[PDB]
Amino acid sequence: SAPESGPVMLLVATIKGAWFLASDPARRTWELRGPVFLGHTIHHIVQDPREPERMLMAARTLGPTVFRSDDGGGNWTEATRPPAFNKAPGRVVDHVFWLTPGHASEPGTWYAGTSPQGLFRSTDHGASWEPVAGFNDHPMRRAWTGGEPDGPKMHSILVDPRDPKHLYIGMSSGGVFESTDAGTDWKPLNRGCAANFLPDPNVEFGHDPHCVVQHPAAPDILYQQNHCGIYRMDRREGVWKRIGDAMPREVGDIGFPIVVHQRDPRTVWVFPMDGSDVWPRVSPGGKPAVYVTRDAGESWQRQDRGLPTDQAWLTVKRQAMTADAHAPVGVYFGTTGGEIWASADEGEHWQCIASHLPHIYAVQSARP
Ligand SMILES: [Cl-]
Ligand SMILES: [Cl-]
Ligand SMILES: [Cl-]
Ligand SMILES: [Cl-]
């Protein structure tokens, strides 16, 4: 990986529309465009890295759908067939929560994760979606998911860069699950991860991962921010290890998002929150900070330069942190209070580049 260069774009999904932030090549001044779809609840906006001119946006009302653009966001068209569960001999899609573009060798293929938990696939750039039957009708599904916050959801859909058949998914609640046959079969992969909200924490599934990532440079390495900690797994070992235990006692290792440095599998960023109350309640602290590790979780450093020093009760949701692929890597986050904070030096300094936006669900980097 050669570092990317030039302008960065941030795709910002909020409860009342989509906004877009564009930088100069130096990433010092930013331009805000939007709202796009003002009054609609936008859950996720993702650029196809295979074809940068293509973008998908998970949105509600039309009911729940996916809008597509083939001109880098200049025009949006609703799905001809959005994600919908099959007729029961039944469950209903509340919203499309997460969008993942497929493997390099399968252009036009995407996965979608819904609330309640459901996995869907498009092979036509998100125009039409069908259920991934191997998950949605798996005999263990109801046991893995359970029943009905905003509702339970499917997230962290990961397609292995080395193999389109190797997939990972995250479910709140349920856990991390793996397929080695493009989703025709799934198995739980939660070993080593706590589930302290369950009667027996040492079960196979039922866990509450918040955000899972597979490193693009070292795809055996997975990181997750869970309701019960920050974990790292080397897939060859098959166990999640709580690297979050290196966090300071007063800060803890609870939070929602997790982000990895594009080139360095040892560098990861989290946004800690107070998880000391009963499940699923996570509360903000008054002293906001991102924490970085540059040694795969052995040590953590606080990153708060430029951020409000105190009486600042910031919530950062799962999809609301992202990072670019520039040198140095820039890091960004969006708060439920409507601020977009940006760093162009791996989280060492922060600058508020947007404020007074509606409640932010997701922030995603993109190449204009
Ligand atoms: Cl449906
Ligand atoms: Cl279905
Ligand atoms: Cl815990
Ligand atoms: Cl709001």
The Cα 64–Cα 186 span in angstroms is 26
Phi–psi pair at 152, nearest 5 degrees:
-75, 155
**114, 170 contact by CB (below 8 A):** no
Q: Which residue has the tokens 């000391």?
A: 276
For 108, other C-beta atoms within 10 Å of its C-beta total: 16
The strands making up 321-323's β-sheet, listed across from edge to edge, are: 321-323, 331-334, 340-343, 351-354
Give the count of beta carbons closer than 10 Å to the beta carbon of residue 367. 16
Question: What's the CA-to-centroid distance between 86 and ligand 2, angstroms?
Answer: 4
Q: Which residues contact 294 (CB under 8 A, 6 or more apart)?
A: 264, 266, 267, 301
The Cα–Cα gap between 81 and 89 comes to 21
Inter-residue contact 317 to 253 (CB < 8 Å):
no
Residue with the two structure tokens 């890295």: 49
CA distance 175 to 204: 9
Of the ligands numbered here, which is closest to the C-alpha atom of 131? 2
Closest ligand relative to 63 C-alpha: 1
Q: What are phi and psi of 271, to 5 degrees?
A: -130, 90
Kind of pairing between the strands at 41-47 and 55-60: antiparallel
What is the token pair recorded at 96?
């499309």
From CA 192, how far away is CA 211, in angstroms rounded?
A: 16
Q: Which-ligand-closest: CA of 227?
A: 3
| Smallest-distance ligand from the CA of 359 | 4
* 341, burial (CB in 10 Å: exposed 0-12, middle 13-18, buried 19+): buried
Distance of CA 31 to the CA centre of its chain: 24
> How far apart are the CA of 183 and the centre of ligand 1, in A?
20
85 and 142 Cβ atoms separated by less than 8 Å:
no
Determine the distance separating the centroid of ligand 1 and the alpha carbon of 74, expressed in angstroms: 29
Distance CA 183, CA 170 (A): 13
Give the Å distance between the CA of 359 and the centre of ligand 4: 4
Looking at the DSSP assignment, which residues form a beta bridge with residue 233? 222, 240
Closest ligand relative to 138 C-alpha: 2
d(CA 150, CA 139): 26
Domain enclosing residue 267, as ranges: 1-368
Ligand nearest to the CA of 137: 2
C-alpha span between 361 and 339 (Å, rounded)? 11
Sign, CA torsion 170/140/164/79 = negative
CA-wise closest residue to 108 among 121, 124, 120:
124
Supply the CATH number for residue 238's domain. 2.130.10.10
* Tokens describing residue 85: 């569960």
Which residue type is seen at 338?
A: G
Distance 85 CA to ligand 1 centre (A): 4
Q: Convert the chain into a string of H (helix), E (strand) and C (coil).
A: CCCCCCCCEEEEEECCEEEEEEECCCCCCEEEEEEECCCCEEEEEEECCCCCCCEEEEEECCCEEEEEECCCCCCCEECCECCCCCCCCCCCCCEEEEEEECCCCCCCCEEEEEECCEEEEECCCCCECEECHHHHCCCCHHHHHCCCCCCCEEEEEEECCCCCCCEEEEEECEEEEEECCCCCCCEECCCCCCCCCCCCCCCCCCECEEEEEECCCCCCEEEEEECCEEEEEECCCCEEECHHHHCCCCCCCCEEEEEECCCCCCCEEEEECECCCCCCCCECCCCCCEEEECCCCCCCEEECECCCCCCCCCCCCCECEEECCCCCCCEEEECCCCCEEEECCCCCECEEEECCCCCEEEEEEECC
C-alpha of residue 131 to centroid of ligand 2, in Å: 5
Please give the distance, rounded to the nearest whole angstrom, from the Cα atom of residue 196 to the centre of ligand 3: 6
Phi-psi region of 192 (alpha: psi -120 to 50; beta: other; left: phi over 0): left
- Report CA(362)–ligand 1 centroid distance (Å): 23
| Ligand 3 center from residue 320 Cα (angstroms) | 22
Say how many Å lie between the CA of residue 91 and the centre of ligand 1: 6
Q: How far apart (Å, rounded) are the C-alpha atoms in residues 336 and 349?
A: 21
Q: b/e string for 190-215 if b means 16 or more Cβ within 10 A?
A: beebbbebbeeeeeebbbbbbbbbbb
Cα of 357 vs centre of ligand 4, distance in Å, is 7
Instruction: Tell me how far the alpha carbon of residue 279 lies from the centroid of ligand 3, in angstroms.
Output: 10
Q: Which ligand is nearest to the CA of 337?
A: 4
Is 179 exposed, middle or buried, given 0-12, 13-18 or 19+ CB atoms closer than 10 A? buried
Residues less than 5 Å from ion ligand 2, measured at CB: 85-86, 131, 136
Count the domains in the chain.
1
Q: Is 137 left (phi over 0), alpha (psi -120 to 50) or beta?
A: alpha
Q: Give distance in angstroms: CA of 235 to centre of ligand 2.
A: 29
End-to-end CA distance of the chain: 19
CA–centroid distance, 273 to ligand 3, in Å, is 12
268-272 sheet: strands from edge to edge: 255-260, 268-272, 290-293, 301-303
CA 282: distance to chain centroid? 17
Whether 192 contacts 233, CB under 8 Å = yes
Integer Cα distance of 149 and 339 in angstroms? 22
Structure tokens at 28: 């010092």
Report the distance separating Cα 14 and Cα 7, nearest Å: 22
Å from CA of 254 to ligand 2 middle: 33
Residue count (the chain)? 368
Q: Measured between alpha carbons, how far is 359 from 16 in angstroms, rounded to an integer?
A: 8
User: Phi/psi of residue 137, each to 5°?
Assistant: -115, 25
Question: In angstroms, what is the C-alpha Rg of the chain?
Answer: 19
Taking the C-alpha atoms of residue 94 and residue 149, their distance in angstroms, rounded to an integer, is: 13
Tell me how far the alpha carbon of residue 171 lies from the centroid of ligand 2, in angstroms: 16
Q: Which ligand is nearest to the CA of 95?
A: 1
Report CA(337)–ligand 4 centroid distance (Å): 7
